[PDB]
């Protein structure tokens, strides 16, 4: 794992080009960023529209075929053969969607939220923003939602928008050998991390209909200095993506004048009279946050021990395709078993089923366990919300909730592309609704005991107990419900669920980051670590170069095979810092004492190794002056600076190599991400 070099060099070639660009009148590299942020938002909204349309048509076809087969063998009596169809139809879509993740690109597995959360921190997962990853993740999340797994499709929209963002901003393909002569200025890691931040915000905004929650998501992960123009561009892209999704889906729904679907999930309207809360049920919400904190801890611990089994045993690509197919057949079978043995029936209440399956009901009514399945989980989240009381049976809703918990915990580390927000919101709104049935039983039909109000708090509690998002998730929940007064009980519930969750276990997104062993700087230094200085956490025998260094020892430092370093201060008073990629581009063009920033950005993705460049014996005795190619003002800390002081220069102004100096300006020690996340 390598870091991205987000801090610019500001060398002589940087200063010479920024003078050349501000001599051509009406300097235009700033308007290009606005064009790119608009295109990022438009394309993220279009990919969300493509996923939504394809998933609803293919799921419509599959459930229509399965419904037509249950209806045929109902009174004839061959319902064993109709379990075999739905087990096979789930297994066939999950087979195709798990081969393309396990055999072609395994970084597409799961949601890409830990990987983009690691990219905005500053490590590069190796294939995270390639075009092949985008294609596989979009086709795989479609094939895994159609394959019937206990998953969602909103989580993978963050990674898709970030890949689009890193793709169109470069003006190159890099997989197709296309060099468009259009931008060429944005091919550094500063611009890329800024645009991927914009694309991740656009992905959140398309997923939930929450643009400001997407902006706050991008500001939490990627916790930098305040940049007014970047936050304004990110907000611009986020609004563009919400509007583009809504506008193309309203054309497809046949109206175009009702901009009514801003996200991929739409919580509805909470301005009702039954939806109002009072101050006396604030500790009821605190108790629900306690319950959501302890169930998310059980969810995370059972998934930790399930992930630990799989890394040691189910880790061959053919062996993890077979696991996903079996989970698909078992979800089909457990759904059919709960549907078959269910007894409550129910008539239509205005499109509340959309595949009304009469199995054994009384010819005007329909099987209501079959309506908990056979729906999208989004429609089930919206229907546990907003329904009038008496709409659910406590036995069947309680038995659906218990089963879906283990099905969604057992479907998270599978080798498919898949989200976990919508399973968490469905688990929480289900036991949130059941808490409302008991409240409406123990107090009579009181107006404040509306069970659709408690599904919201329960969904917030379970989503906060599994993944411990507080500030962005409160704004997402408050912005999807269109009610600003709900953010006070929602934020109390999310505080309580984070505290009660963090006492037990780490949290689902951080836990897989920790199991994949990436460095991953946190928000602050650890609490019992204020007594350390910089001289404890630093790398003390620093390998250095000089301003006028001989060439035969530059190639000797870069060829060591035990000390794979990428940052070299050039000195022994500190004069600056040079990178490994720059000083390989210096040796390729033979820049000796025996280049105008186009060349240091020409070979920019995947710089060549030192075992690809041939220096003759006569050229190992000449000199390479590094004085105009080095970063002349690197960031330094004194040797006595405390660890919270050096943690916050590193994380905020996102650094790669931090030099520790004496009071003689003598280089003693070097600080990077590994030296500074191991405490």
């Amino acid at each position: 794992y390598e870091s991205l070099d987000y801090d610019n060099s500001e060398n002589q070639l940087f200063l010479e080009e920024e003078r050349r660009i501000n001599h051509t009148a009406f300097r235009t590299v700033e308007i290009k960023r606005w064009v790119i942020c608009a295109l990022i938002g438009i394309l993220t909204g279009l990919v969300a529209c493509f996923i939504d349309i394809v998933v609803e048509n293919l799921a419509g076809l599959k459930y229509r075929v399965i419904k037509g087969n249950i209806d045929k063998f109902t009174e004839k009596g061959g319902l064993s053969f109709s379990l075999l169809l739905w087990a096979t139809l789930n297994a066939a879509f999950v087979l195709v969607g798990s081969v393309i993740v396990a055999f072609i690109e395994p970084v597409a597995a799961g949601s890409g939220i830990p990987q983009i959360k690691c990219f905005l921190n500053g490590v590069k997962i190796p294939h995270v923003v390639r075009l092949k990853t985008l294609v596989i993740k979009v086709s795989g999340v479609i094939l895994s939602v159609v394959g019937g797994l206990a998953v969602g499709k909103e989580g993978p929209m963050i990674h898709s928008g970030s890949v689009i963002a890193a793709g169109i901003s470069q003006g190159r393909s890099t997989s197709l050998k296309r060099d468009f002569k259009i931008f060429e200025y944005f091919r550094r890691d500063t611009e890329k991390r800024d645009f991927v931040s914009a694309g991740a915000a656009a992905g959140v905004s398309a997923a939930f209909g929450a643009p400001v929650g997407g902006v706050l998501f991008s500001l939490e992960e990627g916790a930098s200095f305040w940049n007014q123009f970047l936050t304004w561009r990110i907000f611009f892209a986020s609004m563009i993506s919400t509007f583009t999704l809504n506008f193309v889906l309203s054309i497809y729904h046949g109206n175009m004048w009702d901009l009514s679907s801003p996200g991929l999930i739409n919580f509805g309207r909470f301005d009702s009279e039954k939806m109002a809360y009072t101050i006396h049920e604030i500790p009821v919400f605190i108790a629900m946050g306690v319950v959501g904190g302890v169930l998310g801890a059980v969810f995370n611990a059972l998934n930790y021990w399930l992930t630990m089994f799989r890394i040691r045993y189910i880790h061959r690509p053919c062996l993890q395709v077979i696991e996903a197919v079996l989970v698909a057949a078992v979800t089909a079978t457990v759904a059919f078993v709960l549907i078959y043995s269910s007894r409550d029936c129910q008539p239509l209440q205005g499109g509340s089923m959309s595949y009304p399956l009469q199995l054994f009901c009384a010819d005007g009514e329909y099987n209501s366990m079959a309506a908990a399945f056979f729906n999208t989980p989004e429609k089930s989240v919206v229907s546990l919300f907003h329904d009038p009381p008496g709409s659910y049976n406590p036995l069947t809703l309680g038995l659906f909730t218990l089963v879906y918990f283990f099905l969604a915990c057992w479907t998270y580390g599978l080798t498919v592309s898949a989200g976990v927000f919508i399973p968490s919101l469905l688990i929480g709104a289900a036991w949130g609704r059941l808490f409302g049935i008991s409240l409406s039983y123990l107090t009579g039909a009181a107006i404040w005991a509306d069970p659709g109000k408690y599904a919201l708090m329960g969904a917030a509690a379970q989503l906060g107990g599994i993944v411990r998002m507080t500030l962005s998730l409160t704004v997402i929940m408050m912005e999807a419900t269109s009610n600003v007064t709900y953010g006070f009980p929602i934020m109390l519930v999310l505080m309580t669920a984070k505290i009660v969750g963090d006492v037990f276990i780490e949290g689902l997104y951080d836990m897989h980051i920790q199991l994949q062993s990436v460095p991953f700087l946190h928000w602050e230094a650890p609490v019992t670590s204020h007594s350390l200085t910089a001289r404890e956490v630093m790398s003390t025998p620093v390998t250095c170069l000089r301003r006028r260094e001989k060439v035969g020892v530059i190639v000797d430092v870069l060829s060591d095979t035990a000390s794979n370093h990428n940052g070299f201060p050039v000195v022994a008073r500190l004069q600056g810092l040079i990178l490994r990629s720059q000083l390989i581009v210096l040796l390729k063009h033979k820049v000796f004492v025996e280049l105008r920033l186009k060349d240091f950005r020409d070979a920019y993705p995947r710089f060549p190794p030192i075992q690809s460049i041939h220096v003759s014996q006569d050229e190992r005795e000449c000199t390479m002056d590094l004085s105009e190619f080095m970063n002349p003002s690197p960031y330094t800390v004194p040797q006595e600076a405390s660890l919270p002081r050096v943690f916050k220069l590193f994380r905020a102004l996102g650094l790669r190599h931090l030099v520790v100096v004496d009071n003689r300006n003598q280089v003693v020690g070097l600080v990077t991400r590994k030296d500074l996340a191991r405490y």
Binding site: T74, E75, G77, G78, L79, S80, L83, L84, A87, F309, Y313, I314, L319, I322, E323, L326, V327, A329, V330, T333, V334, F336, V337, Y340, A362, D363, G364
Partner: protein, 207 residues
């Protein structure tokens, strides 16, 4: 006096007293065909003549409708139109609300046949025998009409009430049921699929 301020013009009092005559008739028709829901087939000419009597005043329009904060002739006609739209009585009528459509008059004749067979076949086992064949074609014709009117996009309240009575009389209060023993093959395929994960997890753990 000036006209229209304390009283009514004489060519405007007559057009209120005939709309008063047909609206009482329509209200009485609704409440008399209320619970055996014969609504859309009994009250359609009274409804059409209420609509015509309002069209014959909206063509003293300024002296009846737009002359008060409370518009009694407006809100009572709008109530009749909301009643007519919510019943979907246009499904029961053919093309121009002249007579009952062929679909509904054919459906309401089988409903009579099915109820006469229910009465003649009066232990509900002689009811369930010899009359499952009429309930089947009745339910299939109901599904046919329901998908037929879905090819335009509830049905008419006159046919939904009849099918509601028939299903409520057949499923409960007759308890005509089909046994359909299919538990044993369903359990055996359920247990076989749920036993595949423990085989996969053990055989990958041992090997």
């Amino acid at each position: 006096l000036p006209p229209d301020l304390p009283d009514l013009d004489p060519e405007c009092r007559e057009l209120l007293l005939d709309f008063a005559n047909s609206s009482a008739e329509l209200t009485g028709c609704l409440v008399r065909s209320a619970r055996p829901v014969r609504l859309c087939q009994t009250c359609y000419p009274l409804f059409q003549q209420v609509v015509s009597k309002m069209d014959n005043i909206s063509r003293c329009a300024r002296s009846l409708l737009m002359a008060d904060r409370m518009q009694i002739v407006v809100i009572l006609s709008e109530f009749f139109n909301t009643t007519w739209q919510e019943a979907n009585c246009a499904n029961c009528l053919t093309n121009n609300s002249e007579e009952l459509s062929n679909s509904t008059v054919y459906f309401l004749n089988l409903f009579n046949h099915t109820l006469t067979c229910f009465e003649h076949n009066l232990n509900y086992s002689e009811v369930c025998k010899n009359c499952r064949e009429a309930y089947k074609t009745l339910s299939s014709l109901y599904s046919e009409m329901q998908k037929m009117n879905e090819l335009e996009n509830h049905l008419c309240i006159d046919v939904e009430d009849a099918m509601n009575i028939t299903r409520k009389l057949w499923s409960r209060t007759f308890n005509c049921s089909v046994p359909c023993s299919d538990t044993v093959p369903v359990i055996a395929v359920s247990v076989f699929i749920l036993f595949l994960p423990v085989v996969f997890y053990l055989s990958s753990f041992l090997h």
